[PDB]
Amino acid sequence: ALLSFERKYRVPGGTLVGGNLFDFWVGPFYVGFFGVATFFFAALGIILIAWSAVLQGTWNPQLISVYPPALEYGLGGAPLAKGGLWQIITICATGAFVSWALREVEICRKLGIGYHIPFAFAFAILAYLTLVLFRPVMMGAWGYAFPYGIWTHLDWVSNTGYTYGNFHYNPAHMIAISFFFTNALALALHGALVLSAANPEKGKEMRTPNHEDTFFRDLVGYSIGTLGIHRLGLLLSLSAVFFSALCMIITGTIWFDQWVDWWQWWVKLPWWANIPGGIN
Amino acid sequence: DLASLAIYSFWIFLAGLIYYLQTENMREGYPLENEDGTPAANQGPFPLPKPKTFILPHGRGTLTVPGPESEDRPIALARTAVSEGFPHAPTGDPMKDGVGPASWVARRDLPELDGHGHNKIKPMKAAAGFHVSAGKNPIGLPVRGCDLEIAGKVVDIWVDIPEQMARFLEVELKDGSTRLLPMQMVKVQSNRVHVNALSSDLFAGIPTIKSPTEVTLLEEDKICGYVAGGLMYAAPKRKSVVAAMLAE
Amino acid sequence: QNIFSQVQVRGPADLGMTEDVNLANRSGVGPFSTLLGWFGNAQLGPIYLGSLGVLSLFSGLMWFFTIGIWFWYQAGWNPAVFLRDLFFFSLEPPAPEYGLSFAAPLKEGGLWLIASFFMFVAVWSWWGRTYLRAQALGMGKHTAWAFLSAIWLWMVLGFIRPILMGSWSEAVPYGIFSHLDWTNNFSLVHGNLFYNPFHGLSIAFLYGSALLFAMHGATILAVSRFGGERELEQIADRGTAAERAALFWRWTMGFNATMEGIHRWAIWMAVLVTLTGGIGILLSGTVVDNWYVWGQN
Ligand code: BCL
Ligand code: BCL
Ligand code: BCL
Ligand code: BCL
Ligand SMILES: CC[C@H]1c2cc3[nH]c4c(c3C)C(=O)[C@H](C(=O)OC)c4c3nc(cc4[nH]c(cc(n2)[C@@H]1C)c(C(C)=O)c4C)[C@@H](C)[C@@H]3CCC(=O)OC/C=C(/C)CCC[C@H](C)CCC[C@@H](C)CCCC(C)C
Ligand SMILES: CC[C@H]1c2cc3[nH]c4c(c3C)C(=O)[C@H](C(=O)OC)c4c3nc(cc4[nH]c(cc(n2)[C@@H]1C)c(C(C)=O)c4C)[C@@H](C)[C@@H]3CCC(=O)OC/C=C(\C)CCC[C@H](C)CCC[C@@H](C)CCCC(C)C
Ligand SMILES: COC1=C(OC)C(=O)C(C/C=C(\C)CC/C=C(/C)CC/C=C(\C)CC/C=C(/C)CC/C=C(\C)CC/C=C(/C)CC/C=C(/C)CC/C=C(\C)CC/C=C(\C)CCC=C(C)C)=C(C)C1=O
Ligand SMILES: COC1=C(OC)C(=O)C(C/C=C(\C)CC/C=C(\C)CC/C=C(\C)CC/C=C(\C)CC/C=C(\C)CC/C=C(\C)CC/C=C(\C)CC/C=C(\C)CC/C=C(/C)CCC=C(C)C)=C(C)C1=O
Ligand SMILES: COC(C)(C)C(=O)C/C=C(\C)CC/C=C(\C)CC/C=C(\C)CCCC/C(C)=C/CCC(C)CC/C=C(\C)CCC=C(C)C
Ligand SMILES: CCCCCCCCCCCC[N+](C)(C)[O-]
Ligand SMILES: CCCCCCCCCCCC[N+](C)(C)[O-]
Ligand SMILES: CCCCCCCCCCCC[N+](C)(C)[O-]
Ligand SMILES: CCCCCCCCCCCC[N+](C)(C)[O-]
Ligand SMILES: [Fe+2]
């Protein structure tokens, strides 16, 4: 079925590959060549994971866990049982995500809109690739990737973090967090503002953009604007993921000890390094 | 055990919240329809929400939603398959028929107003005190189409007064008349303002405005839809990047 | 790209709507920043400042200076040191022994309590400001409601939880590194917080806010060419911008939202971050001493 105003948009075209071959819809979902590719990669990965569960001995979601090759395999292949399955699932994941993104590009073309969404999504994909491809390679071992388990991957986050003491000290990490907190702050603010205008005090007429602007202007002395609040949201979100990837790509590659010791470059700076007093 | 009770109650709350949220997002577009405009058999598991009424400002009435308000206008499309899920190809010129990525909606045929009751968008020459404050001032620049031919010249900026920003560029054509071009569909360069979506021959086709001092929401939609629809429907006339580089 | 504007425009300073606002409490317009002008609005101010604003603004600065003075103190009033150890200084809360009393000596707990009182006032007076500015303009109270969720966690961290546990020593210290250490230690003493279901939910909502704002932010920009950012008007009279936006998602993921609805998904995705978080923290040490253990049975 379609939305009461949909028909006029379901026209031919927009495809990047295969022409009109896969240019059709299945219910609400649009397919296209990459819709097919997504299914393929998705199915293959879910099947290989289900297969990894058999060899493991459970169908318990909270226990299933596909680990990457042991450090013993460096960047080489590994028996489907000791890292291979992971390797091939990681391949299916990357192939599914990327296809998913290319699938949004075709939809953008058929709808005549900008490519901001898939472009934004690619930042998510790159952060993923940083954890399972880039960082592992730079450290020369597939074994540094995180395991695919609902709970086992937190163990990884936990153990990977404590390898360098309290991870809070990773400077790039502080920046990432700041954008994550700021973005949620901004999301709640934007949502509330648009809502406070469309749904004013009972009985009154819905407010106008000028009200949104004056409310915020009265509250903090500034209004970023309707166009600007959306650029901000995208900016805050992508920057959070950019710095997340950055904080990891440098951990274990160019930095190896307790992150807290890195802050010494500032404490031991020649001019004030030995001045008596304070904490140091 | 409070914890168990809490996490248990949270999952019950979340389920209802998603249910509530999903139904609130059905105040437009539903009920669903079969490709021929008839109500679909399966409307899904979520029900239409209880209507809501928006008291519109500037005495422009009210808006109750969800509402029976239908499609109404004609669509130059024809199905290409007997089954569902297949494209509907245009029977005429998609650009001129306003279908596909060139689509528009029958919005109110009056200008959007600012909080004070005044026309939200205005040609800079009529916007008291407004001036270009940063970046290249496009007024006076020639306009080049995607076919690399001169489509016209910029004779003014249409400004969003409250949001205090540029929305359209008023481009004058050979015949002496003007058209409005969406600001985000043009590229302002130091010696030209390039319009990739359309070719010089498509400019006269851009929908016009009945009054030369304002634009109605209806006209904005036709203009914007028309210009965007050129990304797909004017692809044959879109010369390459190297070709553009070759023309300095 | 429509991330940055190509050309900036400027006209008469916009003094805003009047409605029932006391025009006497508003300042004049500030300067116009061409810099901010590339990303959002160039105009700064005016800002409304009634008694609540001044009160709040006063407490806030006092809170900030109480900490600052303490830092200068333990820096030996030496400027070179102050800057060197800025992140290492910390205004600590009263040791356990003092319970919830104010008996603790200034240099060992009282100064923290003073700073806290200033913060308490500053935050709550600002909450009313949030409610009132909306009221004067005849708008809903969504902002104040959402702000309350953030206040909920802040309240749990330094007020409700410490009181339920018997001492101010449970609260968070006012310091850059120290408050970070307090966070790592918190998870440490309560079994592993990753085993706390509300902590994991709070994460789903934090990641989810990033996910949702990227989506919404990119969507509106993707359709700014059809005036998609004039959201209130798209709500009142659906345009091709709201339809293409809805259809992109419907075709991509099987369902979609409305120009208004999307803002409800948004307020909830963001607000649930601190709502679930606050619950998981209030439950820690009060009802559950060890999350790994709790999850075990
Ligand atoms: C949630 C669990 C922990 C916690 C875990 C972390 C972790 C983990 C990190 C932070 C980080 C930050 N935390 Mg903390 N933090 C908590 C509770 C708080 C509270 C609070 C009122 O409860 C405050 C004021 C802070 C404040 C701060 C900032 C110093 C920093 C950036 C926050 C941000 O971007 O907000 C978003 C909102 C805005 C940008 C609006 C403006 C807010 C401004 C910037 C806040 C400034 C505070 C001011 C008092 C001091 C400024 C620093 C000067 C050198 C004096 N945290 C609780 C106890 N916090 C990150 C950091 O960089 O630490 C160094 C970081 O890595
Ligand atoms: C004890 C543990 C350590 C620690 C160890 C680590 C480690 C180790 C890591 C982080 C990482 C992160 N940390 Mg930390 N961290 C600590 C404490 C904190 C605190 C805190 C309040 O104390 C905070 C706020 C953070 C915050 C953060 C973020 C900056 C970052 C996670 C976001 C991210 O990577 O997005 C990126 C987003 C993604 C990877 C998602 C990708 C999604 C893909 C593209 C698509 C999936 C589709 C899907 C399969 C579809 C399913 C089906 C559909 C639903 C239908 N940390 C403590 C000190 N931190 C991680 C990081 O920064 O990585 C870059 C990381 O590796
Ligand atoms: C980001 C930095 C770290 C990390 C740190 C954490 C921490 C710390 C926590 C999680 C938590 C979660 N993580 Mg993780 N996680 C990482 C990478 C991933 C990837 C990935 C492909 O890169 C995925 C898909 C997940 C998925 C998940 C969910 C099981 C859960 C909630 C996510 C959420 O709501 O986000 C926002 C997204 C949405 C709201 C959209 C919906 C996403 C859904 C829920 C994903 C379902 C995935 C499914 C269970 C597994 C794949 C399904 C396939 C069909 C096989 N993580 C990296 C290594 N993750 C929380 C948890 O409770 O784990 C038990 C938690 O506490
Ligand atoms: C080793 C450390 C522990 C840990 C310990 C904790 C603890 C302890 C806490 C969290 C909390 C959180 N953790 Mg954890 N966390 C870990 C690992 C992670 C990882 C990770 C990838 O490994 C992630 C993604 C997270 C993510 C998160 C967040 C979802 C959550 C905080 C939400 C928030 O908005 O705070 C930011 C928001 C606030 C604090 C609200 C502030 C409101 C007030 C009103 C602001 C006042 C401002 C002031 C007046 C100054 C104004 C200045 C301006 C410039 C004007 N944690 C590990 C396991 N985590 C918090 C939580 O909720 O747990 C459930 C918490 O308390
Ligand atoms: C849904 C949860 C999210 C959320 C929501 C949220 N926050 C909110 C709201 C909402 C909906 C508001 O309405 C309220 C707001 O007013 O937004 C602008 C706010 C707010 N959230 C803020 C911060 C904040 N929120 C946070 C988090 C979150 N907020 C969550 C992610 C965080 C963190 C830690 O993640 C922070 C730091 C504030 C910007 C604002 C409320 C401010 C307030 O309570 O009043 C305090 C008043 C003061 C005057 C203190 C001033 C302190 C300055 C540091 C002084 C600087 C002095 C210096 C200039 C001079 C001295 C030095 C010089 C001499 C060198
Ligand atoms: C970059 C900024 C943020 C962002 C943005 C973003 N994400 C996006 C988009 C954008 C703009 C989309 O358009 C796209 C979307 O369509 O959402 C509705 C999407 C999306 N973000 C998703 C998830 C997601 N995003 C995340 C994060 C973020 N997304 C960033 C914070 C997270 C986390 C953990 O924080 C998650 C879990 C999906 C809902 C969706 C993309 C869905 C998709 O790719 O479809 C194709 C694939 C499948 C249907 C299934 C593939 C199955 C695999 C083959 C199995 C292997 C899985 C394995 C690698 C791990 C499993 C175990 C885990 C426990 C680790
Ligand atoms: C009307 O409308 C509106 C709305 O609507 C309703 C709104 O909602 C809103 C709401 C919006 C807001 C409130 C927006 C606020 C806006 C912002 C832009 C804020 C953004 C915030 C941040 C960036 C966070 C700021 C805060 C903090 C605390 C930052 C902390 C950072 C640090 C501690 C680290 C800083 C230092 C360094 C050095 C960087 C470290 C990074 C690295 C990568 C270094 C790595 C290093 C190494 C590995 C080692 C070193 C090695 C080197 C260099 C080389 C190799 C070595 C050799 C020896 C050669 C508004 C306004 C609105 O108007
Ligand atoms: C203002 O604006 C805006 C909107 O709106 C107005 C919006 O909405 C949104 C979007 C936002 C929302 C709706 C809010 C809610 C969203 C969130 C909280 C974000 C998180 C999201 C989720 C948890 C949901 C995630 C869901 C996903 C990723 C999709 C799940 C997918 C599936 C179950 C299906 C998988 C699909 C695939 C693999 C591809 C497509 C289909 C196929 C491959 C099928 C192929 C089959 C075949 C080829 C077989 C043969 C078939 C045919 C037809 C040929 C033969 C037939 C004949 C008849 C001859 C935003 C941002 C916005 O700002
Ligand atoms: C330049 O030097 C001068 C001196 C000029 C300065 O201005 C410098 C000032 C700086 C040095 C200030 C630096 C400040 C910081 C680094 C601050 C950092 C603060 C934090 C990270 C705060 C984090 C968390 C805070 C929390 C969770 C607070 C909660 C508190 C409360 C809910 C308050 C509860 C109230 C109490 C206990 C009072 C008693 C009870 C009542 C009911 C009144
Ligand atoms: C899409 C997964 C999340 C939503 C799953 C469906 C939740 C339905 C909850 C219905 C609750 C109804 N009611 C009337 C009891 O509130
Ligand atoms: C985490 C958020 C998940 C939300 C899932 C909501 C599912 C809603 C399904 C709506 C289906 C719409 N349809 C096809 C009936 O029109
Ligand atoms: C987030 C920054 C907020 C800045 C608020 C500035 C308000 C305008 C300046 C005060 C009024 C000055 N005055 C009277 C000279 O116009
Ligand atoms: C408004 C959208 C809400 C989306 C909620 C998504 C929840 C994801 C699953 C969290 C799993 C948590 N836990 C505690 C079981 O680990
Ligand atoms: Fe929005």
Q: Kindly list the structural domains of chain C, giving each domain's residue range(s) and its CATH number in brackets, ordered by start.
A: 1-140 (1.20.85.10), 141-297 (1.20.85.10)
Contact, A101 vs A121, CB < 8 A?
A: yes
Residue with tokens 């407490």: C59
Centre of ligand 11 to C-alpha B243, Å, is 46
Strands B121-123 and B178-182: unpaired
Contact, B110 vs A31, CB < 8 A?
A: no
Q: How many C-beta atoms lie closer than 10 Å to residue C281's C-beta?
A: 24
CA distance B67 to B49: 11
The residue count for chain B? 248
Q: How far is CA A202 from CA B53, B107, B178, C22, C147, in A?
A: 11, 26, 45, 22, 21
**DSSP state string for A46-58:** HHHHHHHHHHHT-
Q: How far is CA C250 from CA A26, A31, B26, B154, B231, in A?
A: 11, 12, 12, 38, 22
Q: How far is CA B16 from CA A23, B77, C88, in A?
A: 37, 40, 46
Whose CA is closest to atom 16 on ligand 3?
A153
What backbone phi and psi angles, to 5 degrees, belong to C191?
Answer: 70, -165
Residue A216 identity: F
CA distance A241 to C205: 15
| DSSP 8-state secondary structure symbol assigned to residue C160 | I
Contact, A209 vs A226, CB < 8 A?
A: yes
Closest CA to B152 of B140, B162, B143: B143
Spatial CB neighbours of A132, under 8 Å, sequence gap ≥ 6:
A68, A90, A93, A145, A146
Q: How far is CA C102 from CA B244, C95, C109, in A?
A: 75, 11, 8
Is the minimum CB–CB distance between C106 and chain A shorter than 8 Å? no
Residue with tokens 């998913």: A100
DSSP H helical segments within chain A, as ranges? 32-56, 85-111, 116-129, 135-138, 152-162, 171-198, 209-220, 226-249, 264-267
Å from B234 to nearest chain C CA?
17
Q: How far is CA A214 from CA A198, B55, C139, in A?
A: 15, 20, 11
Q: A120, C217: Cβ pair inside 8 Å? A: yes
Contact, C13 vs C41, CB < 8 A?
A: no
Closest CA to B70 of C244, A6, C258, A4: A4
**DSSP state string for C219-264:** HHHHTGGGTTT-HHHHHHS--HHHHHHHHHHHHHHS----TTHHHH
Q: What's the distance, CA A276 to chain centroid?
A: 46
User: Which of C43, C138, C246 is opposite residue A200, by nearest beta carbon?
Assistant: C138
Q: For residue B40, list chain C residues with Cβ-Cβ distance below 8 A.
A: none
Domains of chain B: residue spans and CATH: 2-106 (4.10.540.10), 107-239 (3.90.50.10)
Nearest residue of A to residue C3, measured between CA atoms: A231
Bridge partners (DSSP) of residue B89 are B78
A168 labeled binding residue: no
Angle at C154 (CA atoms; ends C153, C156), nearest 5 degrees: 60
Instruction: Resolution in Å, one decimal, please.
Output: 2.5
Q: How far is CA A111 from CA A76, B94, B173, C152, C242, in A?
A: 44, 13, 28, 42, 12
As a 3-state breakdown, chain B gives helix, strand, coil percent values, each rounded to 5, of 25, 25, 50
Angle at B29 (CA atoms; ends B92, B89), nearest 5 degrees: 20
Is the minimum CB–CB distance between C257 and chain B shorter than 8 Å? yes
Centre of ligand 7 to C-alpha A177, Å, is 9
| DSSP 8-state secondary structure symbol assigned to residue B106 | -
Bridge partners (DSSP) of residue B182 are B168
Chosen from B5, B11, B24 to mutate, greatest number of chain C CBs within 10 A:
B24
| DSSP 8-state secondary structure symbol assigned to residue C3 | S
Closest CA to C287 of C165, C122, C152: C165
Taking the CA atoms of residue A213, residue A216, residue A217 and residue A220 in that order, the dihedral angle to the nearest 10 degrees is -160
| DSSP 8-state secondary structure symbol assigned to residue C88 | T
Domains of chain A: residue spans and CATH: 1-163 (1.20.85.10), 164-263 (1.20.85.10)
Tokens in use for C163?
């009181």
Per DSSP, the three-state class of C29 is: coil
Contact, C130 vs A219, CB < 8 A?
A: yes
Centre of ligand 13 to C-alpha C201, Å, is 5
Q: How far is CA A240 from CA A185, A245, A250, B24, B134, in A?
A: 13, 9, 16, 30, 30
Strands B178-182 and B142-144: unpaired
**DSSP state string for A57-122:** T---TTT--BPPPPGGGTTS---IIIIIHHHHHHHHHHHHHHHHHHHHHHHHHHHT--SHHHHHHH
